[PDB]
Structures are given as C-alpha cells and as structure tokens.
Amino acid sequence: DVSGTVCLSALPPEATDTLNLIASDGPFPYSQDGVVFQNRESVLPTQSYGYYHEYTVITPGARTRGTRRIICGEATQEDYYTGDHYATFSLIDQTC
C-alpha cells in the first residue's frame, strides 16, 4: 500500500533535483537511473512490467547511491518517493 502523500517541500532538496531531471529526461548522474522498477514486493499497485521506473535521489555524504529513490508510474504526476530502499512509499504532492 502507498503510505499517504508527502509534500515535495518537505522532502530532502535532492528529491526536487531528481524530479527536475525526470522532467527533462536527464541527463542522469547514474547509469542505473531510469531502469524499470519491478514492484516485486507488490507495495505499489500491480501493473504490467515496465510501468514503473526508478531514479536515484542523491544522499549528500553517502559513499554509495544510498536508499532514496523516486519511482514514476505512467499516470500524470504519478511519482512516489521512498527513503528506505522500497520498504515504504509515499505519493509526492508537488503542490505543497
């Protein structure tokens, strides 16, 4: 299940960076940006393979790509944030 919505202004600023890149179709910092998200744990609504894609949300100070990601779906503004490597997701509200 999606854990409610979260205002974009409340997320780490890098979340805004990633959305901006998704809007311009990159260029993305990591070669893994834009790969299909399989939704293998079925936390998000079931859809055909390829419906969701994932993008890194950089964690300043981390030595790796870390655990923050934005997952997009095909619907308009259908963007989910996860800060715990897909354990939980929130739908991003870009209006607050």
Which residues would be at the binding site for ligand 2GP (CB under 6 A)? 32, 37-41, 54, 65, 69, 86
> Judged by CB under 8 A, does residue 12 bind its own copies?
no
85 is catalytic: yes
The pair of three-digit structure tokens given for residue 17, joined into one six-digit string: 């960076």
- Return the amino acid letter for 96: C
> Judged by CB under 8 A, does residue 61 bind its own copies?
yes
Question: Is the preceding omega at residue 27 within 30 degrees of 0, hence cis?
Answer: yes
Cα–Cα distance list, 48 to 3, 54, 84 (Å): 22, 15, 24
54 is catalytic: yes
Contact of residue 68 among its own copies, ligand 2GP, none (CB under 5-8 Å per partner type): none
Binding test (CB under 8 A) with its own copies, winner from 46, 48, 76, 95: 46
Binding test (CB under 8 A) with its own copies, winner from 23, 40, 64, 95: 40
> Judged by CB under 8 A, does residue 31 bind its own copies?
no
Please report the sign of the dihedral spanned by the C-alpha atoms of residue 84, residue 36, residue 71, residue 42: negative
What span, in angstroms and rounded, lies between the C-alpha atoms of 58 and 44? Answer: 22
Tell me the catalytic residues.
54, 85
